[PDB]
């Protein structure tokens, strides 16, 4: 309809404004922090996409869990994610954050960060290359682009 | 803190506030362990309740030598003037 | 549902409260509008709310037990409350200024239409008014939480868990025992 057309254009607008200005937060844990830095390096350069770091959880859109989630930093990751305002996203980077990885059977590793936080993008690697991490951020943009917020709002 | 009557009444009141001590068998010469039926931890939180109400700290050597309310009121009479 | 699926377990919760409810958070969101107005002072209606962990344990113990085929359970709280001292208990746990006033039976639905003109999620409506001012019936012939091996948790253990969010900083960390229990009926 006409109002459906208006809320479809507004869905395109606000999903564009949320995907073309993703703000990750400076959250490294392990070796994937190095490759996340290289995704912020001059060569691959997240910031050409509109993607800039902000260190506080209050002012970030995505939290790239770069590294191993141990049993001693599960509540710190959970409270850091919970202090992020909606909408918040999680890009699980590397094998230890995805599924425990190389320290899966060990006593002090949370076997995947999907146990603690909801995960929207899984980027496989050990470490995934900064080009592949950039591909994970672009797949996050392709996930934000097909959000249907005001369409489902108008159709409820 | 002045006379032994009020000190003894305050001992018995703090003891009957404790919800495991029966006020029926609770006397001045009743025994905590083998007659009131209390654990050592019960006796130690009794002693800490008395340290809260009376307001002075009893060390560990003379908090185990208190096996009846007569001994509690006597040791408070030793640590005070009366 | 009872006449189209005869072995359906139909479960009756009274008024569930949780961290994401619309019962205690509702009763703590009328410090915005005014002085929490009530029909007939909120003294003629009796409630017994039940906590969501008990209802969820009842639903899963109904899934596990094959004694729930065709039954009709009734999940109720262990203690009944009037509405007035319930709201006063909520505003005493939340540590808020409580000044109630009676809004009449005919003019409070006119405030109920003032909020349901919204295309958003509306704040309140006359249906929520008619449901808060509907007293909880007691159904002794129907089973409850004690007929599923579930011990019901009362309100004074979990209302602090619900209502620690709605506090200001000046009483942000007041303890559970630093409030007076409400008057059951």
């Amino acid at each position: 309809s006409r109002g459906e057309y208006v809320v479809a254009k507004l869905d395109d607008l606000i999903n564009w404004a949320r995907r073309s200005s993703l703000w990750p937060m400076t959250f490294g844990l392990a070796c994937c922090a190095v490759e996340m830095m290289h995704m912020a390096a001059p060569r691959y350069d997240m910031d050409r996409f509109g993607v800039v770091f902000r260190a506080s959880p209050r002012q970030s859109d995505v939290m790239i869990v770069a590294g191993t989630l141990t049993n001693k930093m599960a509540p710190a990751l959970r409270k850091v994610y919970d202090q992020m305002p909606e909408p918040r996203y999680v890009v699980s980077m590397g094998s230890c954050a995805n599924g425990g990885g190389y320290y899966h059977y060990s006593y002090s590793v949370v076997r995947g960060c999907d146990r603690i936080v909801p995960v929207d993008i899984y980027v496989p690697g050990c470490p995934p290359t900064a080009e592949a991490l950039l591909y994970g951020i672009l797949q996050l943009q392709k996930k934000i682009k097909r959000e249907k917020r005001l369409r489902i709002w108008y159709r409820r | 803190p002045l006379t032994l009557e009020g000190i003894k009444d305050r001992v018995l009141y703090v003891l009957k506030l404790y919800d495991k001590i029966d006020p029926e068998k609770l006397s001045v010469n009743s025994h905590f362990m083998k007659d009131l039926g209390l654990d050592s931890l019960d006796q130690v939180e009794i002693i800490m309740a008395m340290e809260d109400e009376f307001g002075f700290e009893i060390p560990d050597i003379d908090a185990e030598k208190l096996m009846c309310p007569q001994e509690i009121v006597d040791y408070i009479a030793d640590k005070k003037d009366v | 549902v009872r006449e189209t699926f005869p072995e359906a377990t139909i479960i009756k919760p009274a008024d569930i409260f949780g961290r994401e409810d619309r019962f205690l958070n509702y009763f703590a969101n009328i410090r915005w509008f005014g002085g929490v107005p009530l029909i007939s002072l909120g003294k003629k209606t009796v409630k017994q709310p039940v906590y969501i962990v008990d209802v969820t344990k009842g639903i899963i113990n109904a899934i596990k037990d094959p004694d729930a085929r065709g039954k009709t359970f009734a999940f109720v709280g262990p203690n009944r409350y009037l509405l007035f001292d319930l709201v006063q208990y909520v505003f005493a746990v939340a540590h808020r200024p409580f000044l109630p006033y009676p809004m009449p039976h005919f003019a409070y639905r006119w405030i109920g239409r003032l909020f349901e003109i919204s295309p958003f999620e509306p704040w309140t409506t006359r249906d929520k008014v008619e449901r808060i001012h509907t007293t909880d019936r007691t159904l002794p012939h129907l089973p409850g939480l004690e007929d599923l091996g579930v011990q019901a948790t009362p309100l004074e253990l979990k209302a602090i868990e619900v209502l620690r969010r709605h506090r200001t900083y000046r009483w942000l960390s007041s303890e559970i025992e630093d409030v007076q229990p409400a008057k059951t009926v």
Binding site: G67, K72, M73, Y102, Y103, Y105, Y107 | - | -
Partner: protein, 52 residues
């Protein structure tokens, strides 16, 4: 904001490397050393290689 006492709590990245080494072979025990000092990878490779 003057500093009186620093107490570094560590172990937020403790994963139990040197218990997982005991249950794997030597060739399998090498890739833990890539991940200890992950900006000095082939150095730790060289140190474990010289040890074996």
């Amino acid at each position: 904001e003057m500093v009186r006492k620093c107490d570094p709590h560590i172990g937020l990245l403790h994963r139990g490397t040197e218990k997982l080494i005991e249950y794997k072979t030597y060739l399998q025990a090498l890739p833990y050393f890539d991940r200890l000092d992950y900006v000095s990878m082939m150095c730790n490779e060289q140190a474990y290689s010289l040890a074996v």
